[PDB]
Design a protein around this ligand. Structure first.
Ligand SMILES: Cc1ccccc1C(=O)N[C@@H]1[C@@H](O)[C@H](O)[C@@H](CO)O[C@@H]1O
Length: 457
């Protein structure tokens, strides 16, 4: 707007501007950290998915899948057939009071009757008995696919006595009632690599850009450190990994962690998942709020104005999103927002700063966010491929285009349009649902023809 203001704006341009050189530096220690975690030790979990097989698109049949979080349980029935799939679903809301039940039988009892309900709805007969895939985004501890132990409750549950294998926990309540078999317990990122690969052979990774961020890809058993248990395993071929890289650089030798980012760390149930904190859009409204508050204090904006704004995480992700989507010019939509929302009255020169700031903040989450994608392709040597992306942040103003060209940056591609880029980020197929059904079909057979599903016991 005015000189004093433009100055302050260019310095925020210095703070949130992240050049390829930085991105290249980050990507480089990312390769290494990746390696680190596949080795006998390392800070990125890099937990094997136990998906030992590619997948054809020629796999057929009826498969069950569920995923539940706080709120709902999605039960999906999916119909598989020579590279296409038909899903049908239903959701059930967690009985208020579940999450904090004293009795564990309650949770499983819940998923078993919902299951009973869906089948009775869906079949009303049926003879064979169908495999089920449980996507349990919560805590590793898969020894095998058919496994799964709660490491720690996320999503805000707290149910006494579980850090057990959640699997035996649920089937039990099945027999009791009757009809299906839990053949695989998995992660949402795995699911999207898999289901997405069944429909598109060119898929090289499965990534989520939502509240949390993570990715999955296929490594190969001989390039791992798990090599000490196997036998029936092709002796060097096809192992899916759940990176759980939202923790990269908790050591901090290389993310361009600004003062705003330190603060966000601190105020968080502290000091972890720093790659997530620096590229998760879940925190982008709070990063926006901090600079804003910082300029108020230095008396450059919101002169006079009252603050109900100085409330940690008052601004969610939808605030910069909306400010970025502001179509016209005098940024009429932001003024509306700040106003009665916060009851602030800003002039258009401020709105200009608020917008330019949302701008920086979005683009850098989008840029940093692909550093672990290009790290995989490099480490695994994928010169071309498709990255199947899922997450809420992909229905965030210009995120798709941003990471895309961030990638063109890191690599150096001189290409006009995205569609022409060697590695393209495309939308995934359903990770949580179908991906979990496609992994059961894979699983089940391995069991069937008993080929082996985990580390030698
Ligand atoms: C915080 C924590 C600690 C270690 C291992 C798992 C977690 C986690 O929830 N991480 C989840 C991850 O499992 C999931 O794939 C993504 C995308 O949905 O969201 C977070 O990153």
């Amino acid at each position: 707007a005015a000189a004093x203001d433009x100055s302050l704006v260019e310095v925020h341009x210095x703070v949130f501007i992240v050049p390829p050189x930085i991105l290249q530096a980050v990507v480089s220690i990312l390769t290494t950290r990746x390696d680190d975690x596949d080795s006998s030790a390392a800070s990125i979990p890099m937990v094997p998915g136990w998906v030992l097989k590619q997948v054809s698109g020629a796999q057929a049949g009826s498969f069950l899948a569920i995923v539940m979080g706080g709120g709902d349980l999605e039960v999906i029935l999916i119909s598989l057939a020579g590279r296409q799939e038909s899903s049908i679903x239903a959701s059930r809301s967690l009985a208020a009071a579940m999450s904090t039940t004293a009795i564990p039988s309650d949770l499983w009892g819940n998923x078993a009757x919902s299951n009973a309900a869906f089948s009775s709805x869906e079949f009303s007969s049926x003879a064979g008995s169908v495999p089920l895939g449980f996507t349990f985004x919560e805590a590793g501890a898969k020894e095998x696919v058919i496994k799964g132990q709660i490491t720690x409750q996320a999503x805000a549950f707290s149910l006494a006595x579980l850090x057990k294998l959640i699997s035996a926990m649920x089937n039990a309540x099945f027999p009791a009632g009757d009809x299906x078999x839990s053949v695989a317990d998995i992660x949402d990122s795995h699911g999207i690599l898999x289901x997405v690969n069944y429909t598109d052979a060119x898929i090289k990774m499965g990534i989520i850009f939502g509240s949390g961020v993570n990715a999955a890809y296929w490594c190969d058993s001989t390039x791992i450190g798990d090599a000490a248990d196997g036998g029936x395993x092709g002796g060097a071929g096809x192992m899916x990994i759940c990176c759980d890289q939202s923790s990269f650089r908790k050591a901090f030798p290389s993310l361009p962690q600004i003062x705003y980012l330190x603060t966000l760390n601190x105020x968080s149930p502290x000091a972890x998942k720093t790659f997530x904190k620096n590229s998760x859009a879940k925190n982008x409204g709070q990063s926006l709020r901090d600079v804003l508050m910082x300029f108020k204090x230095x008396g450059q904006x919101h002169x006079x104005x009252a603050x109900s704004f100085x409330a940690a995480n008052v601004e969610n992700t939808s605030y910069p999103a909306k400010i970025q989507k502001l179509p016209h010019f005098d940024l009429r939509x932001x003024x509306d927002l700040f106003x009665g929302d916060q009851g602030i009255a800003x002039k258009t020169x401020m709105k200009x700063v608020v917008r330019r700031x949302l701008f920086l903040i979005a683009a850098y989450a989008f840029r940093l966010v692909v550093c672990x994608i290009x790290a995989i392709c490099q480490k695994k040597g994928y010169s071309s491929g498709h990255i199947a992306a899922x997450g809420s942040x992909r229905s965030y103003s210009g995120f798709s285009x941003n990471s895309a060209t961030x990638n063109x940056n890191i690599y150096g591609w001189p290409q006009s349009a995205x569609x022409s880029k060697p590695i393209x980020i495309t939308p995934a197929i359903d990770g949580x649902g179908a991906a979990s059904x496609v992994i059961x079909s894979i699983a089940s057979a391995x069991x069937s023809x008993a080929x082996x599903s985990a580390x030698x016991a």
